[PDB]
Design a protein around this ligand. Structure first.
Ligand SMILES: *[C@@H]1O[C@H](CO)[C@@H](O)[C@H](O)[C@H]1NC(C)=O
Ligand SMILES: *[C@@H]1O[C@H](CO)[C@@H](O)[C@H](O)[C@H]1NC(C)=O
Ligand SMILES: *[C@@H]1O[C@H](CO)[C@@H](O)[C@H](O)[C@H]1NC(C)=O
Ligand SMILES: *[C@@H]1O[C@H](CO)[C@@H](O)[C@H](O)[C@H]1NC(C)=O
Lengths: 248, 596
């Protein structure tokens, strides 16, 4: 969509693979504000609303929290302390055509300052002077809707890069969905630390003759001591016993 | 509710609207030059009418804004250029005489004719036919016939046409409340609204004339020196008591005297500075020629070329069927698109032109951050003088030995530099009197204090006095030889070449003092100094956003037109020029001796 018509959709109930962006070897505008790229994989926040728009090359720095400009004021303003990341990459091979890319428009002027994270869709014309416009272009109408022209022969400053912005903010809604965590092959018959989904402990792993119904994740036998877990990566039921210890 | 916020809204609307239309016109003009096709002629007229009508609409909307209350200077310069009415003042029945006359000039000039009268065998074009007959032959009789082959067969049909042109272009100024059409061309140099920086329009005529009294004694000795080595070849064919013919001064227009060096070489026994044989032993091509030129500029400090030029532009002459013209021109398509349009050859002239046409490109991306109306040079002389300072540095023997064109053991004595410096004197000093005299005649005839019967007797009488040329044949009023030149016929301001020289040497002395070079200006170099590169690019990036009179104060510190830093360039040449002309008759009076 256009820069002035940026969408807002919620991403939830699925795993978010941020690691595929690191090894893509195609992004040149990988900056994060208020958070580290490495530490946002295991932990995440809700409200995973994604905003998609196209920003020209000479005004990439304009789209940033705490930074003002031309696009950053009357098209899309990022509020302060925006805990998010910006990723942009060139799209000359597909998002361009000869004679000008007459598909993207934007709003250039507006009477009042825009509130953060609101979208206005209207055909209202600018009113710089006291004399109103009666629908006919004059000295004070200045129709803000203009179509940008992108060509394959444009310079690097005018090259339109494909940019996507992911927003992460903490609200009262709990139970957010985050990215994946590393898994390691199970080792058997050894006192080995384990940390499954929600529980952890130390003990020796061995085969189990007991059988589990397919909707339990683990189990305990006596005095809230876990003795059997079933990893969903294998669909196999095991026994856990504390490894050998005692007094000499 | 302020005019300042109202002007920024209008220029922001125009900048995005114009760059869409300017890119369509620049892309259309590029395919015309690159490819000649039938439909492409119709295609140019389609894009050019809606582009010309767009400027008509923007000029009417800015007229209702009053100019007596805008204290901001950034939008005042933009509104002054946008409010030039141009052709909108003319009526519909008179404006149709504009597009008709200008297209007739291009088609008439394209007709090549050297067929002999009463003997119509065949005749070819200008490039294979006319250039060989002026650069190689040494016969007086046929060149005299060739002189009458164009001024009596082509200029005879311009006498009713050019006089109609100069009575209606002069009338727009009264309809635009100016004095004359000569004052209209001085509006590019007019600066108003700045305290202490104001440049009056009439002071420029006085200041230009005041600087000419030191150009004249230098040109007196140049004509005296060149007259002793030409009468050696023609003992009884030219008399050594008068002046020289006009059709023996190197080019068709006599602008550059570079072609008389081979005929009038002082000492031809030692070899000249020629490296055409040096590149062919190592098999140099077009790619390796331009690769070392790009790394020369990035060594200075200027930014390198973008990635959308090497794989997109054309460099050599492609194919056999493409007969498109490749006259060397600089292209500014906008939006980061930069191209060079020329046919490469392994020659002396094309190698220097390759450096010359890139300098205008290197000026164009500097003001790329400026708005579209200010995306230009500071004046008409800046964009030409900026493109020539790297030409002075690239012709130095030090820069030629830096790349590796010259031999590693090439001594630099006196005579190896006098040969180079006299080549520069013929292309720089020799063009100063010709630019001032021709522009001085056009300004007063547009002002109007010259009647009809005193055009030719005053034009010829200054050629005998200033230039020093005796007319080989008397000419009556039916001739119209001053209107045959390309610039005068096509409405081009020739004053941008007079201020080009006075600017390209003000910048040269200022930049060489920053690099602390110990020696004269001819041996000075710019490379291997990163302090000078960052200093220049900050002033290059300003463009027209600042006044040009502030650009002078940014380099030399003197607000006036200084004449002292030009003789210091030629002190080694002037002391040598003074000893050979000890006994020769320097300084001509009025001379009716040969053709009384
Ligand atoms: C998920 O479980 C299945 C069945 O045991 C297994 O084949 C698969 O390898 C596991 N995870 C993946 C996708 O590797
Ligand atoms: C004049 O207008 C320009 C707009 O580019 C602005 O930057 C500058 O501050 C203005 N000058 C004054 C004195 O306000
Ligand atoms: C341009 O033409 C209009 C047409 O009437 C006129 O009002 C205006 O003064 C002209 N502008 C100039 C600078 O002559
Ligand atoms: C150049 O001439 C000067 C005197 O005019 C002389 O001192 C100098 O040695 C000459 N240079 C060379 C390289 O001979």
């Amino acid at each position: 969509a256009s820069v002035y018509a940026w969408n807002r959709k919620r991403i939830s109930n699925c795993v978010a693979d941020y690691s595929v962006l690191y090894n893509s070897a195609s992004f040149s505008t990988f900056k994060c504000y208020g958070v580290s790229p490495t530490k946002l994989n295991d932990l995440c926040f809700t409200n995973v609303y994604a905003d998609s728009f196209v920003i020209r090359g000479d005004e990439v720095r304009q789209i940033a929290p705490g930074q003002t400009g031309k696009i950053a004021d009357y098209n899309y303003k990022l509020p302060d302390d925006f805990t998010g990341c910006v990723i942009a990459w060139n799209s000359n091979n597909l998002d361009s055509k000869v004679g000008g890319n007459y598909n993207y428009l934007y709003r250039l002027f507006r009477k009042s300052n825009l509130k953060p994270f609101e979208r206005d869709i209207s055909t209202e014309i600018y009113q710089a002077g006291s004399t109103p416009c009666n629908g006919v272009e004059g000295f004070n109408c200045y129709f803000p809707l203009q179509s940008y022209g992108f060509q394959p022969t444009n310079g690097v400053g005018y090259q339109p890069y494909r940019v996507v912005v992911l927003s992460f903010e903490l609200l009262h809604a709990p139970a957010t969905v985050c990215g994946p965590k590393k898994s390691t092959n199970l080792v058997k018959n050894k006192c080995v630390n384990f940390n499954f989904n929600g529980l952890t402990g130390t003990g020796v792993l061995t085969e189990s003759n007991k059988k589990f119904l397919p909707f339990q994740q683990f189990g305990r036998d006596i005095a809230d001591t876990t003795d059997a877990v079933r990893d969903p990566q294998t669909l196999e039921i095991l026994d856990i016993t504390p490894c050998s210890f005692g007094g000499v | 509710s302020t005019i300042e916020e109202q002007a920024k809204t209008f220029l922001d609307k125009f900048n995005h609207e114009a760059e869409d239309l300017f890119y369509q016109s620049s892309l259309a003009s590029w395919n015309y030059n690159t490819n000649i096709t039938e439909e492409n002629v119709q295609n140019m007229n389609n894009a050019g009418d809606k582009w010309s009508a767009f400027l008509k609409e923007q000029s009417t909307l800015a007229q209702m804004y009053p100019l007596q209350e805008i204290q901001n200077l950034t939008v005042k310069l933009q509104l002054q250029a946008l409010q030039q009415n141009g052709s909108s003042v003319l009526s519909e029945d008179k404006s149709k005489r504009l597009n008709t006359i200008l297209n007739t000039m291009s088609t008439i000039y394209s007709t090549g004719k050297v067929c002999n009268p009463d003997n119509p065998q065949e005749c070819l074009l200008l490039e294979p036919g006319l250039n060989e007959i002026m650069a190689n032959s040494l016969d007086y009789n046929e060149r005299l016939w060739a002189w009458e082959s164009w001024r009596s067969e082509v200029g005879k049909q311009l006498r009713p046409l050019y006089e109609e042109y100069v009575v209606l272009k002069n009338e727009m100024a009264r309809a635009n409340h100016y004095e004359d059409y000569g004052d209209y061309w001085r509006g590019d140099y007019e600066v108003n609204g700045v305290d202490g920086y104001d440049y009056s329009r009439g002071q420029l005529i006085e200041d230009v004339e005041h600087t000419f009294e030191e150009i004249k004694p230098l040109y007196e000795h140049l004509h005296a020196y060149v007259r002793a080595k030409l009468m050696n070849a023609y003992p009884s064919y030219i008399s050594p008591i008068g002046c020289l013919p006009a059709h023996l001064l190197g080019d068709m227009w006599g602008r550059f005297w570079t072609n008389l060096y081979s005929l009038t070489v002082p000492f031809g026994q030692k070899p000249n500075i020629d490296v055409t044989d040096a590149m062919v032993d190592q098999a140099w091509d077009a790619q390796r020629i331009f690769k070392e030129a790009e790394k020369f500029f990035v060594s200075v400090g200027l930014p390198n070329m973008t990635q959308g030029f090497w794989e997109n532009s054309m460099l050599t002459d492609p194919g056999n069927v493409q007969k498109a013209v490749c006259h060397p021109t600089a292209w500014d398509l906008g939006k980061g698109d930069f191209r060079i349009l020329m046919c490469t050859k392994v020659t002396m002239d094309d190698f220097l032109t390759a450096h010359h046409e890139m300098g205008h490109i290197q000026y164009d991306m500097a003001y790329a951050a400026q708005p579209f109306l200010l995306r230009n040079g500071a004046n008409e002389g800046f964009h030409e003088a900026v493109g020539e300072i790297m030409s002075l540095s690239a012709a130095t023997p030090k820069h030629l030995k830096s790349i590796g064109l010259l031999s590693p053991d090439f001594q630099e004595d006196n005579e190896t530099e006098i040969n180079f410096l006299l080549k520069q004197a013929l292309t720089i000093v020799g063009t100063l009197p010709f630019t001032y005299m021709l522009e001085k005649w056009r300004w007063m005839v547009f002002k109007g204090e010259i009647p009809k019967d005193q055009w030719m007797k005053k034009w010829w009488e200054m050629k005998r006095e200033i230039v020093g040329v005796v007319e080989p044949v008397p000419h009556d009023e039916t001739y119209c030889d001053p209107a045959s030149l390309f610039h005068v016929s096509n409405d081009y301001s020739f004053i941008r070449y007079y201020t080009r020289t006075l600017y390209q040497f003000q910048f040269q002395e200022a930049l060489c003092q920053a690099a602390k070079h110990e020696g004269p200006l001819h041996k000075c170099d710019i490379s291997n100094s990163t302090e000078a590169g960052q200093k220049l690019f900050n002033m290059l990036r300003l463009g027209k956003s600042e006044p040009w009179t502030l650009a002078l104060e940014n380099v030399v510190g003197a607000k006036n037109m200084n004449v002292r830093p030009l003789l210091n360039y030629f002190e080694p040449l002037f002391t040598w020029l003074k000893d050979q002309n000890k006994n020769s008759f320097v300084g001509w009076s009025t001379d009716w001796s040969p053709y009384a």
